[PDB]
Design a protein around this ligand. Structure first.
Ligand code: HEM
Length: 148
């Protein structure tokens, strides 16, 4: 598919520096939804402010893990149903940590933003639409952790 390569070409840019880009994703995400901030409870302590997350080595490890999952979503963009059970259960983990169903769309907006930021003019209206479908397929999978 053409779309699937568009995701693949786009991702390449981001993939190179996962931490720098995921940092953007998370700063954006807390700007949009600041109530995600206390869900991280590294050392049984809440971050007070968004900037405190960036100083947390455990938080940065999480960014890396996030980018790795989006990475898997990319490598499997043509057949994404192979990631489904993983993503379901990652969703369930996240429900437990206290993330809402509604928060996942903000993560998708935040992913999208990180992408727009990184590709600048290369973030075509097609590139956008394709990414939105990919991550939507990721939430949709991460939302089956809310089931039963
Ligand atoms: C939406 C806001 C998010 C919050 C508040 C959040 C929070 C957390 C927390 C607190 C953990 C457990 C502590 C840790 O391993 O660092 C966790 C684990 C994880 N997160 Fe997130 N997360 C979010 C989004 C994401 C997204 C979008 C992804 C990937 C798409 C991601 C991927 C992971 C993975 C891979 C783990 C390890 C899970 C495991 O035990 O198997 N997270 N997250």
């Amino acid at each position: 598919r053409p779309e699937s390569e568009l995701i693949r070409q786009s991702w390449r840019v981001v993939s190179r520096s996962p931490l720098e880009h995921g940092t953007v994703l998370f700063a954006r995400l807390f700007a949009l939804e600041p109530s995600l901030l206390p869900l991280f409870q590294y050392n049984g302590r809440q971050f007070s402010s968004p900037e405190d997350s960036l100083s947390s080595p455990e938080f940065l490890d999480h960014i890396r893990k996030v980018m790795l999952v989006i990475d898997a979503a990319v490598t499997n963009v043509e057949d994404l149903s192979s990631l489904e059970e993983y993503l379901t259960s990652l969703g369930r983990k996240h429900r437990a940590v206290g993330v809402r169903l509604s928060s996942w769309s903000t993560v998708g907006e935040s992913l999208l933003y990180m992408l727009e930021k990184s590709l600048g003019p290369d973030f075509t209206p097609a590139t956008r639409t394709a990414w939105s479908r990919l991550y939507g397929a990721v939430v949709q999978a991460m939302s089956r952790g809310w089931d039963g």
